[PDB]
Design a protein around this ligand. Structure first.
Ligand SMILES: [Ca+2]
Ligand SMILES: [Ca+2]
Lengths: 238, 218, 231, 60, 231, 231
């Protein structure tokens, strides 16, 4: 046993990321079979792709509960040359936050790949219409005009029959990943804006309810990847 | 064989994040909403353990000229029956209120049963609980939607679950149902008004065990 | 990396909580409710799971002494914020790695353990005018400080239950059936004590904490995670 | 001998369930045969199944 | 030998700079410009690259307090003279070996880390009348002194950027576009703290330094090196 | 597990008892009966079997000083409660693992041993005005403290007897034939002493204890176990 060996400047020290294990306690240990239980789950990416609800504000909702940051939007009677909804491409916003992907990323450092964007409507089925969609990469101005949106990464959704539709972001990045934390709207993370315009106005027969509702979702795509999980915050305990 | 009961009306006074819930098998135990199981329900007391799956249906009246949405989803291991009073609900409370709406107490689970301190200990400030409900996350569970533009009924099946392969018939409460309003009810006035709801159930592969007399009294 | 591998993900240590250093055979805290005058030794019996707990016994709600003063004794609890904020699943099972963390510098101490649901009884005997708490030897292992030392160890799953429910909805007992309390879902309790006789009980005050790590776990089914207030 | 190695936070400590042994004392040890004795007993379950007496109260 | 092999050449450790010892959860220094009255805890958040830096944040020019007195707080910087005088090339990438160097004799300490661009937040919680800065446990490793100890470790390349520019000519941001500031070209920040509660904050003053070594590097393209004044 | 395997079951250490620290060559306690004025050094000759014992000599009954005061000297005994409560068998044989346990912190000590039935004789000799108890060297091993140290060791079966009777019914001698006393059923005695000359005898008082473990045992035939009073 006693032999010349190699010490370390920090032998036996404790770092939170110690890689190996220590002495065991006992033998003779037996455990029961879990076979009767359904479907042991192994990885986050398995579940992260399930469509999650977004949390868009309720347009000055006057209830004493005040805001209702909710996945749906109502149909307006009027329209303007500016999107129904727009937002920066940033993981920190509340609509991102409480998604599966948002909750995951909240404890990760950087992100990579793309996400699935799913869309929905709630009005009477006797409705016919269309909507324009445009992803706006980073630029010198947040898109407003419909024509501007047409210049941006854009597509049009037929509300004629299907009251739901899907989209996936394209992964464009000078770096392998992008900073998950919203330290600042900077070239490291921020990636422009989104826009939403109604293509044509209302078309309904009589007796149909008016100003119906529009709903939306979000969830991870196949290519999405995160890096370096990070620690949490318990302030929600309050 | 199928079993069925009834539920209150979806009314215009109901709002988003408004709901009601049903426990398995507690619905049979209370004959909730007129529900009746009969032979197997009585057998429950005469058998100290059981294991089964389920198979259900739900219905409600809609019309083309309605708008709004509802959600149906099974959730396990919840304590939804527990009130802020600290007990499961009787046949009166839900039959009267008829629609629960979200509040911090259930966004946190603080209503779960607790212990009397006694004079020995300082009183705590209750702030958190693990049985919270985060409604934005419930889409993860397989679920079904009932809406004017979609349907008037739904169908779902679920398996058995539990920390042991089988559990006591009286205490096993692994599965719980909840029904919630996705969007408030509305329709151009005069159409079908505030439709009522009904629900149907079947167990699957039930197996009684622990044969004995009916529930040595409490 | 493939960080999203859950089995790899959680295999790291973290603090559980502090406890007071022992200097004699102790009175285990009585079952609730507890009344003044029933003097008992709170704050040394270190429960062994990050579940909500109170006075060396489990807990269902979370309440804390946000105020610095009041009547009665202050209890203590334990929550693993990281894992509990990351626990979006239903059932669980794993082993448990743990290591000692002394708060007082230059400490000499001895520690012991007993498993989940294992009842406690020590008493003491006089070795030549010196009491020897029986626990100085017994059924379970012990470890000691090298005038300070990072004692480490691991324990396996032990409960008769097949698995650990992440969050629970059953009923605890046939009477006083506490919902949300799965009792048999931990590893027991430990206790740190000075290697001195009861007569050597000192005026000085000492404290010790511990870090805990999950080993070779298994997880099932989804589960929700906390919402955040938007303010 | 002297080489970089792995220490432990609790090296040489004592826990009641230490799994391994230590230095021996001496060689040249000899022991007698127990063969003349009847039936070395190995396990509790061997004997636990022998009917035992119960202790019911004697009615007042 | 074949010393001119660059990969072999630079694989040795050297001092980075000193930092003050921590005794509680700390206020990270605010972004510039900073005004008097915005009290913050400067001099503990140890940035992790020999680039020009200031107050735990990067820097582009080099200015120093050649005078011993003045108004305001004295910041601190960091330059690796050897490598920066030998760095006649353009782009770079490598891993990083580092080891602890305590300045105070007979010190007991604990240290932590978080990666490049990783934001900081600790706060603290009261364990039985004793605050426990959350950072005592968390996402990242930790190591401790054996009443003094040479804690050592290594970290890999981490930035989303493909490589490290030796000297830079781009622009940092879309607004306030600081030229010469490639932000994502370091490894993060560490922090050394006493293993005591905030209540145990002491009057004594302590300091610690660190040495850093380059590992398995890669270099590209030429670059100039400083001229010398002929006097 | 297969815990019921007896051989595996008992292979763990447990306390034997305390003894006083030695500081010179000692007078072995005289055979009974012993009268006042026959001064002898009780409480250092540590017998080596958990049988009932008294004053470094075996014992048959169990009596203890339930009262704190009286006439005469207080003897000491030794019982292994765990094994003796679990010993439902008749004959036995095994080896014995043992380890030192110092009660005084910061102790420097030396220890020795001699086997079963091995008579004791030390005396002392003056090394330059300093007595050297002969036992400082001799027939048997010795071990020393590293300013405190966990000295460990094992010993084999040694008696001329084939086996160890768990409980006994023979007669000890041809005269004064003590029933229930199998004499040759232990491993001898040890003794802990300071590595100082007799002249260095100090006023301070010190004590040490020991833990003992059974190794590779063998058991035969049934035997009863204690009844419990129903109150
Ligand atoms: Ca060595
Ligand atoms: Ca070594």
């Amino acid at each position: 046993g006693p032999i010349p060996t190699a010490p370390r400047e920090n032998s036996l020290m404790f770092l939170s990321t110690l890689p190996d294990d220590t002495v065991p306690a006992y033998g003779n240990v037996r455990t029961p079979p879990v076979n009767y239980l359904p479907g042991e789950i192994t990885d986050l990416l398995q579940l992260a792709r399930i469509p999650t609800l977004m949390a868009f504000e309720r347009v000055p909702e006057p209830v004493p509960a005040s805001d209702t940051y909710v996945p749906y939007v109502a149909v307006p009677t009027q329209f303007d040359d500016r999107p129904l909804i727009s937002f920066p491409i940033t993981l920190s916003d509340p609509v991102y936050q409480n998604t599966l992907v948002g909750a995951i990323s909240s404890n990760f450092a950087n992100y990579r790949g793309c996400i699935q964007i799913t869309l929905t409507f709630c009005g009477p089925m006797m409705a016919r219409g269309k909507f324009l969609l445009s992803y706006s990469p980073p630029n010198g101005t947040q898109p407003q005009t419909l024509s501007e949106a047409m210049q941006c990464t854009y597509s049009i959704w037929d509300i004629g029959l299907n009251s739901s539709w899907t989209f996936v972001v394209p992964y464009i990045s000078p770096s392998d990943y992008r900073e998950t934390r919203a330290i600042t709207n900077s070239v490291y993370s921020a990636d422009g804006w989104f826009s939403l315009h109604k293509l044509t106005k209302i078309t309904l027969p009589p007796d149909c309810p008016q100003s119906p509702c529009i709903l939306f979702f979000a969830s991870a795509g196949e290519d999405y990847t995160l890096r370096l999980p990070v620690d949490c915050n318990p302030s929600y305990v309050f | 064989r199928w079993y069925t009961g009834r539920l209150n009306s979806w009314t215009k006074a109901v709002k988003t994040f408004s709901f009601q819930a049903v426990p398995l098998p507690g619905a049979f135990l209370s004959r909730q909403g007129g529900l009746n199981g009969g032979a197997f329900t009585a057998t429950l007391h005469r058998h100290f353990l059981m294991k089964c799956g389920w198979q259900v249906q739900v219905q409600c009246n809609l019309t083309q000229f309605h708008q709004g949405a509802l959600l149906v989803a099974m959730v396990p291991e919840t304590t939804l029956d527990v009130k802020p009073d600290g007990k499961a609900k009787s046949l009166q409370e839900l039959n009267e209120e008829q629609w629960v709406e979200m509040s911090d107490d259930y966004r946190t689970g603080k209503n779960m049963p607790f212990q009397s301190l006694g004079t020995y200990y300082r009183p705590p400030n209750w702030t958190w609980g693990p049985n919270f409900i985060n409604p934005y996350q419930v889409t993860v569970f397989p679920h079904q939607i009932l809406n004017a533009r979609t349907s008037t009924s739904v169908d779902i099946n679920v398996p058995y679950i539990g920390e042991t392969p089988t559990q006591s018939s009286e205490t096993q409460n692994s599965w719980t149902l909840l029904v919630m309003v996705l969007v408030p009810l509305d329709y151009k006035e005069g159409a079908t008004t505030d439709p009522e709801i009904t629900f149907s159930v079947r167990p699957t592969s039930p197996y009684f065990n622990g044969l004995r007399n009916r529930y040595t009294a409490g | 990396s493939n960080h999203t591998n859950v089995k790899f993900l959680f295999d790291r240590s973290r603090l559980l909580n502090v406890i007071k250093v022992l200097e004699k055979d102790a009175v285990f805290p009585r079952p609730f409710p507890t009344q003044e005058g029933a003097q008992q030794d709170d704050g040394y019996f270190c429960l062994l799971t990050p579940r909500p707990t109170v006075a060396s016994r489990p807990a269902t709600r979370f309440g804390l002494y946000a105020n610095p003063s009041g009547s009665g004794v202050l209890a203590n609890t334990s929550l693993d914020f990281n894992f509990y904020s990351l626990a979006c699943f239903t059932y669980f099972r794993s082993d448990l790695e743990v290591t000692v963390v002394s708060l007082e510098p230059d400490l000499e101490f001895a520690v012991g353990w007993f498993p989940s649901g294992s009842e406690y009884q020590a008493s003491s005997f006089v070795y030549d005018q010196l009491h020897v708490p029986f626990h100085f030897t017994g059924r379970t292992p012990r470890a000691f400080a090298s005038k300070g030392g990072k004692v480490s160890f691991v324990l396996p799953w032990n409960s008769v239950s097949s698995v650990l429910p992440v969050r629970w909805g059953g009923a605890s007992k046939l009477s006083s059936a506490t919902r949300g309390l799965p009792a048999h879902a931990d590893w027991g309790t430990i206790y740190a004590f000075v290697p001195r006789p009861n007569e050597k009980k000192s005026t000085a005050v000492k404290h010790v904490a511990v870090y805990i790590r999950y080993k070779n776990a298994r997880a099932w089914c989804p589960s929700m995670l906390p919402f955040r207030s938007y303010k």
